[PDB]
């Protein structure tokens, strides 16, 4: 069996205490990163699944084990795909991480529990976000079905169907699966192969990398004369990387505190690539790879590198402090428990603008009709156009309003 890395990024959405990590575990086997130094940087974890098919019935086709002994046929499984999971939490406080996750995602998985109430605002918000950020491949999954009645589940399904009609997602498949009992995952696997294809990707496009997580490889007990370099957990959308290249983290860093800053973006040479489980020479875009570079282990510690752009040497993108946005607003607010009408944008107000993966606070200067000018506090970079989600404050915490695009 060949040790091929991740091909396409699949993300999972839900709610707090509903069950997402458990579902992930059921799907794959290797436990999630979340659940001080290691793993702790963002809200998303790290998981990997296997797609191997046995074609020699009905729904039973794909499996989780490398060896086929369970269904009947003793023959070895055929290699189809290998996928990486991006598990994003569905909490009312933390959403920036989710947004960041969304930017890299190519496939989405919705989770709704049976026993709880049918209309949930957070789930709706998530769906809206998915719709916004160039995602159409959505599979609806029912979580807790075993604790529900014979007709109640059907009713719930009907309600769901009624709800999802006017949205961009038209032909979304619905699967009921148990997380604690471990059943019906084969159908899900089959669907993964059926409904979702891999988009065309080539070597010709300029390298662009997005870092979500940060890692320091330091072990207690062992002497200091045996050290390991700083690892940046970064996912790639476009551009193939190989071992032996120069990488730079774009936005900038503060090194001296009197004296104006002039220091260039953080340069680092690649030491070792961590994909799936074992090290590989080539990096195929469409997965999260722990890129171990010559960067400090102290820098890759905690909340320092959350959603930052990474480029290869011989390419020049632009850095902006003032940004030109083309926005579109929604009718009523999504996320609030009660629904409130969206007000027109007022000059000079603190609003959270999420350009791809960056979590930045911006203030409005001029409003016309569709075009808006924003002043940023923390530095941000622009490459092409980018997919932007906008968030405002009305009551206590952040609420989503609509979508935006950079006009440059």
């Amino acid at each position: 069996i060949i040790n091929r890395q991740a091909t396409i990024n699949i993300g999972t959405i839900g709610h707090v205490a509903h069950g997402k990590s458990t579902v992930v575990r059921a799907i794959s086997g290797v436990q999630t990163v979340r659940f001080l130094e290691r793993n702790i940087t963002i809200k998303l974890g790290y998981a990997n699944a296997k797609i191997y098919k046995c074609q020699e019935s009905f729904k039973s086709d794909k499996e989780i084990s490398p060896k086929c002994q369970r269904p009947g046929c003793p023959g070895r499984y055929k290699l189809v795909r290998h996928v990486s999971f991006v598990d994003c939490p569905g909490h009312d406080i933390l959403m920036s991480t989710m947004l960041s996750g969304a930017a890299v995602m190519d496939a989405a998985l919705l989770l709704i529990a049976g026993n709880e109430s049918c209309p949930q605002p957070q789930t709706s918000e998530h769906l809206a976000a998915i719709e916004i950020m160039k995602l159409k491949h959505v599979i609806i999954l029912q979580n807790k079905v075993d604790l529900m009645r014979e007709e109640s589940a059907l009713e719930h399904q009907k309600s769901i169907l009624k709800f999802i009609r006017g949205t961009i997602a038209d032909g979304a498949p619905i699967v009921p699966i148990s997380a604690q009992l471990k059943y019906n995952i084969d159908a899900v696997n089959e669907f993964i192969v059926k409904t979702i294809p891999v988009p065309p990707r080539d070597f010709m496009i300029s390298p662009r990398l997005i870092v979500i997580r940060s890692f320091d490889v330091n072990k207690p007990g062992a002497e200091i004369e045996d050290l390991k370099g700083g690892v940046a957990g970064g996912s790639i959308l476009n551009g193939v990387f190989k071992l032996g290249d120069e990488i730079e983290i774009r936005p900038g860093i503060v090194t001296k505190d009197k004296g104006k800053i002039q220091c260039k973006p953080i340069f680092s040479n690649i030491v070792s690539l961590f994909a799936e489980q074992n090290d590989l020479k080539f990096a195929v875009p469409g997965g999260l790879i722990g890129v171990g570079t010559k960067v400090d282990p102290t820098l890759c510690r905690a909340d320092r590198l959350v959603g930052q752009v990474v480029g290869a040497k011989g390419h020049l993108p632009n850095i902006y402090t003032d940004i030109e946005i083309n926005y579109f607003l929604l009718r009523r607010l999504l996320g609030v428990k009660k629904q409130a009408k969206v007000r027109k944008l007022e000059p000079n107000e603190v609003l959270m603008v999420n350009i791809g993966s960056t979590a930045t606070g911006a203030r409005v200067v001029a409003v016309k009709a569709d075009m808006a000018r924003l002043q940023l506090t923390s530095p941000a970079c622009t490459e092409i156009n980018e997919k932007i989600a906008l968030s405002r404050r009305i009551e206590k915490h952040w609420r989503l309003i609509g979508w935006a695009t950079i006009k440059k």
Binding site: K59, L161, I174, P176
Partner: peptide
């Protein structure tokens, strides 16, 4: 389209502890 879901549901109902 909501047609092969029913069969799956039935199967789930059948296979339980």
């Amino acid at each position: 389209v909501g047609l092969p879901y029913s069969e799956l549901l039935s199967r789930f109902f059948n296979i339980l502890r």
